[PDB]
From a paper:
Spliceosome is often assembled across an exon and undergoes rearrangement to span a neighboring intron. During spliceosome assembly, the pre-catalytic state (B complex) is converted from its precursor (pre-B complex). The RNA helicase PRP28 unwinds the U1/5′SS duplex, releasing U1 snRNP and allowing formation of the U6/5′SS duplex in the B complex. In this study, we fill an important gap by reporting high-resolution cryo-electron microscopy (cryo-EM) structures of the human ED spliceosome in four consecutive states: two pre-B complexes (mature and late) and two B complexes (early and mature).
The fourth structure reveals a previously unknown state, where the 5′SS already forms a duplex with the ACAGA box of U6 snRNA and the 3′-end sequence of the exon is loaded onto loop I of U5 snRNA. Consistent with formation of the U6/5′SS duplex in the ID B state, U1 snRNP is absent and most likely has been released by PRP28. Therefore, the RNA conformation already resembles that of the ID B state. However, both the conformation and location of the protein components in U2 snRNP and tri-snRNP are almost identical to those of the mature ED pre-B state. For these reasons, this spliceosome is designated the late ED pre-B complex. The 5′SS is specifically recognized by residues 1548–1566 of the Endo (named the Endo-loop). The nucleotide G1 of 5′SS is sandwiched by Phe1551 and Gly1564/Lys1565 of the Endo-loop, reminiscent of that in the yeast endogenous tri-snRNP or B complex or the human ID B complex. Recognition of the exon sequences is also achieved by loop I of U5 snRNA, which forms a duplex with four nucleotides (G–1, A–2, C–4, and A–5) at the 3′-end of the exon through non-Watson-Crick base pairing. Notably, the central base C–3, which is flipped out of the duplex registry, is sandwiched by Arg535 in the NTD and Phe1551 in the Endo-loop of PRP8. In the late ED pre-B complex, conserved helices α12 and α13 of SF3a120 are anchored on the tri-snRNP through direct interactions with PRP6, DIM1, and the NTD of PRP8.
Author numbering:
A (entry chain 6d): 10 to 59, 64 to 85
B (entry chain 2L): 7 to 95
C (entry chain 2G): 300 to 328, 394 to 447, 454 to 485, 490 to 1304
D (entry chain 2M): 15 to 80
E (entry chain 2K): 12 to 119
F (entry chain 2F): 402 to 463
G (entry chain 2I): 112 to 222
RNA sequence: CGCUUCUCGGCCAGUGUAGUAUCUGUUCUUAUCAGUUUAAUAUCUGAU
């Protein structure tokens, strides 16, 4: 019955996601994929300080500084 | 409700859809195709160009007759273009 | 009563004149219209008293209105008080009574016997068992009424239906059924229906003019069945007065009626009537109708109008010049429809029509104008491109000036025209390129259009034909840029258009740069699909298979998307991309991009664990087509891996799976089939066996053919031994497919092996498997043909046993065996036995049981060709004149079937027959001796 | 069946059945060249006068109905 | 603001076989003037009655409130009567006199 | 049954039932009136009542 | 050899356009001919002359240069001859010459 | 997720259209003649 978090990340693949660093930074783009360490592949990602950059292509975002993941 | 038109047998090659595709028309059967289908453009015309000789879809192939109906010589009667109870065309 | 009827019409409109005039001078000064006791004895049926309660009672009633306002404003309110019952009201039915329907079935709120007619009405509520209830009830009740046709007679029936086929709240399912009753009883009653005929159409004709496609076709069916069923002069004498009936609706429909009755009884029967109508000088409204009639005749009878064409037209010309407009309008319209059934024929019959038409074209404003086009356009194909040449050159102008109208009736018309005008052999290329195109693409290609249905199609067509002439790159060049316009239906349109064009014209014309714009396009479209639709997909496939090795630089971008899409985007879109591979297999091959074949092979291979059916299906499909390009022994998931990997899927229940799977398994177990160790197969067998629960034909189809393929791989005995065990519980002919295995199997090694197993297995006491083996022989001989010249003997005694009764079914199926044998052997000389069997067949001749009989007819027909007539006829002599009816019925039906074929042979075999007083029955010729 | 001539039914009269097979005898005799020549030889005429005669006897044979 | 099917007629049921035109006329009398009434007096139609008013909206108010209304120990089935159907037991004839009459007096 | 009816071709005869009429049609005397009238027997003429109409029907036959 | 199926008598036009074929009785069909695109002979679809209970003695192509073509069916009806209990219609029938007329434009064939 | 213990396993009540078959229950072997009907019955139709 338990909902595993990695399963929650898995289903948001190909969706839009907000990724919230432990700092005051945020990235929103399409979630292409992730690994066990929760490193993350984003596509066409907006970078924010809470608009820094419009990324075009694929970003590997180091799971190290990730704090929160938000589908949508 | 469903029976032959049996109008005269022209030179127009028969046309069958996906569904009907294997069937020797009168013997209902897949067996031993040999010889070829003819119907009247009266039966076969226009929207019926390449239309199914049964169901009303587009023809992807050409019905072959069985041999069974062959030696019983039925293939030579009026054109087997089935008319349903409603206006065939 | 007919004369009476029309009298009642002239009445009706005289009345509407009185009232309408009364508010014409009243305006110089409906359902609520007050009523008379004769009028009031006109509605409610028989069997009710009118009342009086009191002249004081009916005085308060008389006081009611005046005191409805008066006592509407006065004192009242109502007060309940806080404080051995009985009387359970009896409602409902086995199929049950809706609340509303009480009004019809009310008399099933009474419970009695001993009333006689009323016992027939009260027994005809069998309907309700038609209208509502369970399916089986509907069935059985339905026949029970059919055989009760003659008996109750129409009158009571239609008296008791037409209310329901009129029901304000009648269900669509209920509609269609109650139609079924009207047909079915109309297979019977013939002379009977006469007084009812109009009293039928009035319900039906609305149905004939029906939005639903299947509705209409039913309607037509029964209006023939009636009209032919009744008499011609019945139909006519019936249906005049609806011609001038005020409502345009009833005319309109009334026409389509006459269309049908005319398809029934032929035009020329009916002509002098029509031709009368269009010369009716009383009023036009008729003529508007009569002409319409011509039309719907045109549409229905269609290609067959041809012979009386000239007459029909000879009606309709006298319209075009008329003073009233519509009559012009509709008229011409008909000419159109005619020609459209005329196609390239009867040109000069239309002949005397033109010269007005052309002139008429000039002077017009409005719907009529474009109508005349609708005609001319459908003419031009019928002319001589010298005469047609001239006349064409005149039209293409007005056509030009008229692209632009807001009218949609218009744009349809002028459109279809261009198809024809510039749809011509005798028209010059550049000219189109200049004058027409730029308008064309301008005003037409717009978002108004494609949202609508017809216009969508008609458009596509037209543009296509402008391609077939001016070339390809011209068109496609101008509409490429719109794949990237947003809204779908539009895109869909450009897409399919192109698809056709590079269908017909061929890719070969297209330049380069434009082409980049294609593939960039055809992806950009393909990447965004609202639904999954065949359109973009096919349209693509054709694109590629046309471009051939011009395509090659573009793959990486394709297959790149193919994968990317393939994954994510969540599964709905997956199957699409899958198919996309399905169709482009061939292109990935011959160009020899093998890294691609590594990619596909293996990565598809992974998905085969995908749980959604509608993906996995398309997945396999892709696999199949992948196999048809790269051979077995080069398969990158080398079969050993694969084929088992499939094997467990076969449970999958869901459809598309079972299809593509068994398909796949088939290809591979046909072609490679060595790659996989036997054991695996026999697992496959024991898994196949219950694929024979398939609701669908195609599955079982390829299923069987596979069963064979493996049966080759292994060898027979087992696989039939195994089939012998299978299909025990198949319902009503479901198992047969197993038998079909026994057959195909029995070919694919020498059946000459297998029989003894089979034959012996008819010993088993279990009845239905017995008959099973009989059919096995049936399909068996059907599939072997010549070879039967041997094992015939083997079966013959068995056919003797089975053919002798246990039950019908034995005789039926067995007899079928006789058939296919009897053809197959033909003329190798094994008759003797077949004669012998003929005996044990013969008595079966007599029965009502439809399957047994049409079986036997099967038998004796074939047997004729095997034995020859002369022997047959020697069974059929005595029968002809046998006193009884029963026998003569049949022996005649046989002797016919003998007779039609081989009539040429007989002569020899009529026996000598002694000549009587008035006549000579001895044919003296044959005895002339040199 | 009906529009295919020579069709019978159980009401078929003696006379009609026999006249049928007469006629068909004939269109055979016109047919099979030899058989014809046979007749010609026996009863000495032309081929023609044969065929002609036959095509007289076509409607008649047996004589009037009953 | 009305459904087209309903008509100045109502089929009316669940009646006793004793029951009175006096009761009837009174009760129904609320909504508006009675065109007239019929009562099934016959072996089958004993138990039911038809009611017709000088206006529909009369009847509308009727089927509105009288819906399932009570009499004695019974709830009256209250329905808008169908039409067309079996009437043609009569014929439409008897224009001639009348329409000559409007033809005459008013001259119109 | 016991309902008044009449066949015109047979002696303007009276029949008391509608089921009776089909039996009368498949009958000796009814076929004698037809065939001796020149209107040949069996199943095309079944619905006959008056002598006149089946004469034009038989002209349609031959 | 049938009574009703063509191939017995055979006739054909001067201009070769169309060819008529006939049994002895009841059936007369017609095949139209035109040379193909390359002037190689393409055969039309058939037609029908059907007329009931009619004996065709002999048929012959007719001459009309570039017209709707004609044919001569020598005929006789026997239908009179059956329904004459007497044996008068046996005599006193005369064989009926009829010219049928192909008509291209309309494409049927009319007595 | 790793380790230990125990259990098991593998290898060397669908649906729709048309149609027939087969049990049981209920009614009649019962007066004459005239028609319909049947191969002949039967059956159906009237009155004493």
């Amino acid at each position: 019955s338990q909902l595993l978090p990695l399963e929650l990340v898995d289903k948001c693949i190909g969706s839009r996601i907000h990724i919230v660093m432990k700092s005051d930074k945020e990235i929103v783009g399409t979630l292409l994929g992730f690994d066990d360490f929760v490193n993350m592949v984003l596509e066409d990602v907006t970078e924010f300080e809470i608009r820094r950059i419009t990324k075009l292509d694929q970003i590997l975002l180091n799971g190290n500084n990730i704090t929160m993941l938000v589908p949508g | 409700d469903l029976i032959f038109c049996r109008k005269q047998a022209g030179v127009a090659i028969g046309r069958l859809c996906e569904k009907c595709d294997g069937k020797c028309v009168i013997c209902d059967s897949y067996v031993r195709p040999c010889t070829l289908v003819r119907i009247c453009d009266e039966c076969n015309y226009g929207s019926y160009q390449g239309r199914c000789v049964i169901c009303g879809g587009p023809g992807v192939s050409d019905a072959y007759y069985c041999k069974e109906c062959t030696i019983q010589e039925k293939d030579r009667d009026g054109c087997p273009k089935i008319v349903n109870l409603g206006s065939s065309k | 009563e007919r004369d009476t009827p029309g009298h009642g019409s002239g009445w009706a409109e005289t009345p509407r004149t009185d009232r309408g005039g009364d508010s014409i001078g009243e305006t110089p000064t409906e359902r609520n219209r007050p009523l008379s006791d004769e009028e009031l004895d006109a509605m409610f049926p028989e069997g009710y008293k009118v009342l009086p309660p009191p002249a004081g009672y009916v005085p308060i009633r008389t006081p009611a209105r005046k005191l409805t306002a008066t006592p509407t404003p006065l004192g009242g309110m109502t007060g309940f008080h806080m404080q051995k019952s009985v009387n359970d009201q009896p409602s409902g039915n086995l199929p049950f009574l809706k609340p509303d329907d009480i009004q019809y079935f009310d008399k099933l709120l009474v419970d009695v016997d001993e009333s006689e007619e009323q016992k027939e009405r009260k027994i005809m509520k069998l309907l309700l068992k038609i209208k509502n209830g369970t399916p089986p009830m509907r069935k059985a009740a339905l026949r029970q009424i059919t055989d009760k046709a003659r008996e109750f007679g129409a009158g009571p029936l239609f008296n008791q239906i037409l209310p329901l086929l009129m029901s304000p709240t009648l269900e669509d399912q209920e509609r269609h059924l109650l139609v079924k009753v009207i047909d079915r009883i109309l297979y019977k009653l013939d002379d009977l229906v006469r007084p009812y005929v109009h009293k039928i159409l009035v319900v039906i004709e609305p149905l004939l003019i029906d939005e639903d496609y299947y509705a209409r076709v039913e309607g037509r069916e029964i209006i023939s069945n009636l009209a032919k069923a009744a008499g011609l002069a019945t139909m006519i004498s019936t249906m005049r007065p609806d011609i001038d009936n005020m409502d345009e609706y009833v005319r309109n429909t009334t026409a389509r009626a006459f269309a049908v009755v005319a398809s029934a009884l032929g035009i020329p029967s009916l002509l002098p009537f029509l031709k009368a109508v269009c010369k009716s000088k009383k009023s036009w409204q008729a003529r508007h109708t009569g002409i319409k009639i011509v039309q719907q005749i045109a549409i229905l009878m269609g290609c067959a109008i041809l012979p009386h064409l000239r007459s029909l037209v000879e009606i309709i010309e006298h319209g075009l010049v008329d003073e009233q407009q519509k009559v012009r309008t509709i008229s011409a319209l008909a000419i159109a429809a005619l020609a459209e059934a005329a196609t390239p024929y009867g040109i000069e019959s239309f002949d005397s029509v033109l010269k007005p038409l052309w002139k008429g074209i000039r002077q017009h404003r409005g719907k009529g104008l474009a109508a005349f086009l609708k005609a001319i356009g459908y003419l031009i194909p019928l002319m001589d491109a010298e005469y047609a040449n001239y006349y064409t050159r005149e039209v293409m102008l007005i056509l030009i000036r008229e692209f632009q109208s807001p009218d949609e009736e218009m744009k349809k018309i002028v459109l279809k025209v261009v198809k024809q005008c510039c749809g011509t052999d005798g028209v010059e290329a550049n000219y189109i390129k200049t004058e027409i195109l730029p308008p064309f693409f301008k005003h037409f290609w717009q978002h108004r259009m494609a949202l609508d249905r017809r216009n969508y199609r008609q458009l596509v067509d037209t543009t296509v034909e402008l391609a077939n002439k001016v070339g390809a790159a011209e068109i496609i060049s101008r509409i490429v840029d719109d794949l990237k316009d947003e809204a779908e239906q539009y895109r869909k349109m450009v897409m399919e258009t192109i698809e056709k064009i590079m269908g017909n014209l061929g890719a070969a014309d297209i330049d380069h740069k434009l082409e980049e714009q294609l593939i960039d396009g055809i992806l950009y479209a393909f990447q965004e699909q609202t639904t999954e639709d065949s359109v973009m997909l096919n349209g693509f496939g054709t694109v590629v298979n046309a471009l051939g090795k011009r395509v090659k630089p573009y793959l990486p971008q394709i297959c790149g998307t193919v994968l990317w899409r393939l994954n994510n985007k969540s599964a709905k879109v997956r199957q699409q991309a899958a198919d996309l591979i399905s169709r482009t297999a061939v292109v990935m091959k011959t160009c020899q991009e093998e890294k691609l074949m590594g990619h596909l092979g293996v990565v598809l291979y992974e998905y085969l664990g995908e749980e959604y059916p509608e993906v996995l299906g398309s997945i396999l499909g892709a696999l199949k087509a992948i196999v048809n390009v790269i051979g077995m022994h080069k398969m990158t998931p080398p079969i050993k891996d694969l084929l088992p990997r499939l094997t467990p899927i076969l449970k999958n229940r869901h459809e598309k799976v079972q299809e593509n799977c068994i398909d796949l398994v088939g290809r591979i177990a046909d072609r490679g089939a060595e790659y996989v160790s036997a054991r695996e197969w026999m697992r496959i067998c024991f898994e196949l066996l219950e694929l024979l629960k398939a609701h669908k034909k195609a599955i079982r189809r390829a299923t069987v053919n596979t069963f064979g393929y493996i049966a080759k791989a292994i060898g027979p005995h087992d696989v039939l031994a195994t089939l012998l065990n299978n299909l025990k519980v198949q319902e009503r002919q479901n198992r047969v497919c197993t038998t079909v295995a026994i057959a195909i199997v029995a070919e694919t090694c020498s059946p000459f092996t297998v029989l003894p197993a089979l034959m012996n297995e008819y010993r088993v006491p279990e009845l239905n498997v017995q008959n099973g083996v009989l059919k096995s022989l049936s399909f068996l001989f059907e599939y072997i043909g010549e070879m039967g010249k041997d094992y015939i003997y083997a079966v013959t005694p068995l056919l003797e046993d089975a053919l002798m009764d246990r039950d019908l079914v034995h005789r039926q199926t067995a007899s079928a065996v006789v058939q296919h044998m009897s053809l197959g052997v033909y003329g190798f000389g094994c008759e003797d036995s077949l004669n012998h069997l003929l005996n044990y067949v013969w008595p079966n001749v007599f029965e009502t049981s439809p399957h047994v009989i049409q079986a036997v007819m099967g038998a004796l027909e074939g047997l004729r060709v095997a034995i020859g007539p002369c022997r047959m006829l020697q069974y059929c002599l005595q029968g002809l004149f046998h006193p009884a009816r029963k026998v003569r019925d049949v022996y005649w039906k046989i002797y016919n079937s003998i007779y039609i074929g081989s009539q040429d042979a007989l002569i020899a075999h009529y026996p000598r027959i002694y000549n009587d007083d008035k006549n000579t029955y001895i044919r003296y010729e044959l005895d002339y001796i040199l | 069946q009906s529009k295919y001539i020579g069709t019978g039914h159980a009401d078929t009269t003696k006379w009609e059945w026999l006249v049928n097979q007469h006629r068909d005898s004939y269109c055979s005799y016109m047919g099979h060249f030899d058989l014809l020549n046979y007749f010609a030889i026996a009863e000495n005429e032309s081929k023609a006068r044969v065929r002609f005669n036959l095509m007289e006897k076509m409607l008649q044979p047996c004589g009037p109905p009953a | 603001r009305l459904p087209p099917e309903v008509n100045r007629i109502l089929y009316i049921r669940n009646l006793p076989y004793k029951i009175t035109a006096e009761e009837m006329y009174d009760i129904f009398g609320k909504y508006g003037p009675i065109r007239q009434i019929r009562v099934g007096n016959t072996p089958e139609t004993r138990g039911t009655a038809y009611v017709v008013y000088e206006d529909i909206f009369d009847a509308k108010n009727a089927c509105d409130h009288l819906s399932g209304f009570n009499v004695c120990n019974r709830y009256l089935v209250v329905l808008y009567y169908n039409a067309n159907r079996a009437f043609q037991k009569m014929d439409t004839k008897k224009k001639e006199e009348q329409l000559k009459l409007l033809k005459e007096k008013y001259g119109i | 049954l016991n309902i008044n009816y009449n066949c015109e071709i047979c002696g303007n005869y009276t029949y008391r039932g509608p089921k009776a009429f089909q039996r009368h049609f498949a009958e000796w005397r009814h076929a004698h009136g037809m065939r001796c009238l020149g209107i040949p027997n069996t199943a095309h003429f079944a619905n006959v009542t008056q002598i006149e109409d089946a004469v034009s029907l038989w002209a349609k036959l031959k | 050899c049938r009574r009703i199926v063509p191939g017995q008598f055979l006739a054909v036009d001067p201009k070769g356009r169309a060819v008529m074929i006939s049994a002895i009785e009841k059936q007369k069909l017609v095949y139209i001919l035109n040379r193909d695109a390359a002037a190689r002979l393409t055969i039309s679809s058939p037609l029908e002359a059907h007329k009931a209970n009619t004996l065709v003695y002999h048929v012959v192509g007719v001459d009309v240069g570039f017209e709707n073509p004609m044919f001569a069916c020598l005929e006789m009806d026997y239908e009179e001859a059956d329904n004459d209990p007497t044996g008068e219609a046996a005599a006193n029938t005369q064989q009926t010459l009829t010219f049928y007329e192909l008509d291209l434009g309309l494409n049927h064939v009319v007595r």
